[PDB]
C-alpha cells in the first residue's frame, strides 16, 4: 500500500529533531579536532568535507550514528592505477609536508592513518565525555569511531583532495546529461575528487560531495520541489529504499547473507534509476507508490543480473561475484520480493 509508505516517511520525519541535536554535538567535537589537527604540519590543510546522509537530508539510520569525512589538501599528486581495478590507486607526487609518510615514492596510507589515529586519540583525551575506537576491518576507511556522551557514534574518514582532472576511469561515468544537464556535468567534473585510504598502500576514489550535490539539487527543473506543482518523490524513494534494506539487514543480522549489502548499493541503484527516468513528471508525488515499486524493481533487476556499476566509475561492478556471492543476492532478492508481494510487512 502506498499509504503504508507514507506512514514510514511520517515516522522517519519524527527523528529529525534528535538527528539535529546529535549533529550539533558532533559538530562541536569535530570542530575542536580539526583545529587541533590543523596545528600539525602534515595535516595543516585539513578541513571538514560536509557529506553523508545527514547533509543530503536522507539520514534514516540511528540518530546516534554519524559518518564524517575530513579532507586534506595535498600537493599536485600523480595517480597510478592498481591492477586495472579502476577505483584503487597508488598516490605519488609530481614534486612536501607529507614527506614523513612516504614509502619509497608512494604515499603510505598505513603511515598517514597511524599519525591521524594517534593525534585524534591524544586530542579526545582533552574532550569531556568522549572516547575513540579504531575502526577495524574496513581497509582504513573509516579510520576511527568517536563515542560522544556515551550515546553518539561518529565514524571519521580521511580523504585526500586533488584539484586535478578526474581520473580516466570516470570518463564515461556520471551520465546525468539528459537529467541534470551537460552543463552541470561539466561543472561537477571541475570540482575536486577525493581518495580515501582503502586496502597494498592503495587509495579509493570518492565522490561523496558530488552525490550530495545531486541528491540536494535533484530535478531537471531548478524549482523541483520548491512549489506544490513541482513536488516530486525522488528523495522519498531513496529514503524508502534505504529503510527497506536496513530493516532487512536488521531482521537477518544473525544470518550472514545480508552483511555485505550496504546503503551505498541502494544509493547507487537509485542514481541509475534517476538516469533512466530523467523527467520530473515521471516522479510525481501522487505516484509515490508506483515510483517506489519501480525503484525496488530496478534494484531487483540489478541483483538478478549481478550488475550495479559505480555511478562515477562504470567499469567497477559493485555486484561482481568477487564482492558479493550469488547466494547473498538470491537471498535478498527473495526477501524483497516477499516483502513487496505483501505490502512490506517489514515496514509495520
Amino acid at each position: 500500500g502506498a499509504s503504508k509508505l507514507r506512514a514510514v516517511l511520517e515516522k522517519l520525519k519524527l527523528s529529525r529533531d534528535d538527528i539535529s541535536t546529535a549533529a550539533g554535538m558532533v559538530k562541536g567535537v569535530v570542530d575542536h579536532l580539526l583545529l587541533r589537527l590543523k596545528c600539525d604540519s602534515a595535516f595543516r590543510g585539513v578541513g571538514l568535507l560536509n557529506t553523508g546522509s545527514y547533509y543530503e537530508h536522507v539520514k534514516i539510520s540511528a540518530p546516534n550514528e554519524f559518518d564524517v569525512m575530513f579532507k586534506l589538501e595535498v600537493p599536485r599528486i600523480q595517480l597510478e592505477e592498481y591492477s586495472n581495478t579502476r577505483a584503487y590507486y597508488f598516490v605519488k607526487f609530481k614534486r612536501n609536508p607529507l614527506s614523513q609518510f612516504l614509502e619509497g615514492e608512494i604515499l603510505s596510507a598505513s603511515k598517514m592513518l597511524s599519525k591521524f589515529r594517534k593525534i585524534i586519540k591524544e586530542e579526545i583525551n582533552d574532550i569531556k565525555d568522549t572516547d575513540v575506537i579504531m575502526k577495524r576491518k574496513r581497509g582504513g576507511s573509516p579510520a576511527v569511531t568517536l563515542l560522544i556522551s556515551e550515546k553518539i557514534s561518529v565514524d571519521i574518514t580521511l580523504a585526500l583532495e586533488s584539484k586535478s582532472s578526474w581520473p580516466a576511469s570516470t570518463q564515461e561515468g556520471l551520465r546525468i546529461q539528459n537529467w541534470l544537464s551537460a552543463k552541470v556535468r561539466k561543472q561537477l567534473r571541475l570540482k575536486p575528487f577525493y581518495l580515501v585510504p582503502k586496502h597494498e598502500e592503495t587509495w579509493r576514489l570518492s565522490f561523496s560531495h558530488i552525490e550530495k550535490e545531486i541528491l540536494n539539487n535533484h530535478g531537471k527543473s531548478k524549482t523541483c520541489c520548491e512549489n506544490k506543482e513541482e513536488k516530486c518523490c525522488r528523495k522519498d524513494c531513496l529514503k524508502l529504499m534505504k529503510y527497506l534494506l536496513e530493516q532487512l539487514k536488521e531482521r537477518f543480522k544473525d544470518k550472514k547473507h545480508l552483511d555485505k549489502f550496504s546503503s551505498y548499493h541502494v544509493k547507487t541503484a537509485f542514481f541509475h534509476v534517476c538516469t533512466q527516468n530523467p523527467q520530473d513528471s515521471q516522479w510525481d508525488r501522487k505516484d509515490l507508490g508506483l515510483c517506489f515499486d519501480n525503484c525496488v524493481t530496478y534494484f531487483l533487476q540489478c541483483l538478478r543480473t549481478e550488475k550495479l556499476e559505480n555511478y562515477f566509475i562504470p567499469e567497477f561492478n559493485l555486484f561482481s561475484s568477487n564482492l558479493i556471492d550469488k547466494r547473498s543476492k538470491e537471498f535478498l532478492t527473495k526477501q524483497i520480493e516477499y516483502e513487496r508481494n505483501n505490502e512490506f510487512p517489514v515496514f509495520d
Copy 2:
C-alpha cells in the same frame, strides 16, 4: 518580421571568429599583465574576473573588449554613501595600508597605484600601449591598445562577506531559476569598483560601487528553469537572442543619433537590466519558445518602452537604485528614445537593414 530578426542574428554570428582571435590576443596580454601585477605586494591577490559580453556569449557590437581585474583583500566593512544604496566607503575589520586615507580605503590612491603599475608593465610588452580612461569615475581605469584592439580594464575589490543590505530584496529569480539558486549565488563574493558617486571634489571621490557582473554572467549562461534549456531541440529558447537583439537595437540607434546628446547616457546595461526583469516576469521556458522569437522580442521591446515611459528601471540587484531616475537621465532623452524605438517597431526595424 521575425525573419528579419533572424537575419540580424545570422549576421552577428559571422563576427564570431574575429571576436575569438581578438579575444585570444587580449587573453595573452592580460594574462602576462596579471602575472606581472601579482608580483606587487598590494596586488598579490589580483586575478581575472571572467565576466563581460564575450564570456556571456552575447558580444554583438564591435575589436573592443571590457575586462575586470578582481582583487582579494582582507575583510571589508562597508559604509553606505548618502543613502545611494550602490555607493560605499570601504573600511577594514593589511596589504593595502599605504592606500588608506584615515579609516577608509582611498579609491583615488588605489587607482593611481593601479594605473602606475599597469603603465610600468606595458612598457615591456611590445605592440601594446596603455592610455588612461577618464570621465568614467575611475571605472574603467585604463584602456590597453593592442597592436587594432582596445581593452578597457576595471579594478574590482572582492568581498567574500554577506552581500550588502541594499541587495536584500534584489535578484528576484526565485520563481525562475529557484530559491536554491538565489541562495547559492548570494553565497558568492561581491565586487566593488572605484566610482565617483557624484561630480565634484570631496567624499564623492572616494566611493566604491557594487558590481555583480559575475552573477549576471552565470544567469545568462545558465538561464532556463530547466537545467537542460537549450541543450536539445525540444528545449531551444530565445532568451539570449532577445538580449542580443535589444543590445543591437540600442547600439544602432545610438550610432544613428550620434549627432544628438539624447541617447548618450543610455548603455547596453539598461537593456540588459530590463531583460533580466523580463525574465523574472516570464519565468517559464515555454514562454520563450524559439518558434515565437518575433513575439518574444516584441514583448522585450515593449517592456523596455514601459520602463522608459514610467521612468522606472531598478538595478536588478539593488531595487532601490533607479537607473532611469531623473538625476541620471532626463525625461526628454527617455521620450526621444521611446519615439525612435516605436517608429522602428512599427516599420519592421529599418535600423536592422
